[PDB]
Amino acid sequence: KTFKQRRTFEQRVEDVRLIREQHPTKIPVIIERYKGEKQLPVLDKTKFLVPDHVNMSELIKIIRRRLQLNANQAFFLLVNGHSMVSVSTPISEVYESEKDEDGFLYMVYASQETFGMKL
């Protein structure tokens, strides 16, 4: 099951309250496989704490390594249901504008054919 399917809203909110207490400089992000994607693998851990200074292109490099991707394997992130406005956008800005009601920032990843047209 996906994260939201496994945890109730109240449990998600409490997860966020506690984790943000414990990690004063990290953003809580859920990073899951796009439903329908079957080239890229599933992560063993899909709950992340991301240093709050990074930008999206830094995060992409990290998640490609987490997935142990080859260089010839395409990867794209959708953040809160849309493509990233820009790879240079700080994750602190992304969190403030795109976070869920529950306090997590949600993303999914996909390969080229699954992701489709990029504009």
Binding site: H23, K26, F48, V54, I62
Partner: peptide
Amino acid sequence: DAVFDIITDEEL
């Protein structure tokens, strides 16, 4: 899948 994966600066 309940434990968080912590990204650190030593990775950047």
